[PDB]
Every structure is written in C-alpha cells, then in structure tokens.
C-alpha cells in the first residue's frame, strides 16, 4: 500500500519484482503470476507500474501487461 | 540516472510524470511526450516505467506504452 509494486521486464519470460523495497531477480513468468496474484489479493489498492530495460521489445513489454491483466491485476 | 522516470496513467488522456523524485500531474499526451523525449536525449540510460490506476483500462496502459514507443522512449 503504502510501497507500489514495481515488476520489471528484463527480456523473453525473465522478470524482476520489486515489493515494498525489496527486489527479488530471476523470476519466471508463472512464478511472477503467483506473487503478483498474492499481493493484490492481500492489498487490493496496490499501485502496480511496469517497465522494461532498453534491449527489451515493446512487444514483450505488451506480453507482460498481458499476463497482469489475465491474472486479475491490471 | 540515478532515479527513474515514472509515467503513470491517470485516465483517458491525462497523465502524471515521476522526474527524481518531482512529481507534476495534469499533463498532456503532448506535453508528457515533450518531457520524456527531454529526459530522454540529455540521458539515454534513464530507466522507464508504466503505470496505471485500476480505473484506468488496459487499452489505455497499451497507449500510453505506444506513445512512449513513438518518441523513442520504449
């Protein structure tokens, strides 16, 4: 709530997630779900903002609000 | 560099832009496009994020994604 939920797109299915300060790597696209899925059944005015590096495509960065909006979460 | 650029969707055609820490709200797509692509030439390594409130639709976020995309943002 009170720390958005930030999950970064850093290439073809590798994500990153940051949850209030803390930043947890090497996550799958199926895992990334399960924990994006908890925090906004846990909090459900969880501010959630993604962004990709530059050597990733807009079309992944697509993919990724994809799988958000397929999960329930924006 | 040191701290990301936020652009977060706020509705239909209104937007607020996170600079280092200074916030600035009632933008225009223009005008969000005119401080991005700003940002953007005086650092080429400024990292990008999206976000947007859970009144805002996902065909929107995917807007807001494509104007970035159009400036050469994202």
């Known amino acids: 709530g009170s720390v958005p939920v ?3 797109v ?5 994500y990153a ?4 300060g803390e930043r947890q790597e090497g996550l799958t696209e199926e895992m990334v ?4 899925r908890q925090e906004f059944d846990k909090d459900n005015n969880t501010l959630f903002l993604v962004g990709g590096a530059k ?3 807009y079309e992944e960065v697509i993919k990724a609000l994809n799988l958000l909006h397929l999960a ?3």
Chains 1, 2 share one sequence.
């Open 55 to 57: 050597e990733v495509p």
């Open 6 to 8: 930030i999950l970064e």
């Open 17 to 20: 997630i940051s949850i209030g």
């Open 33 to 36: 779900t399960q924990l994006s």
């Open 72 to 74: 329930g979460i924006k």
């Open 10 to 14: 850093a290439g073809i299915g590798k």
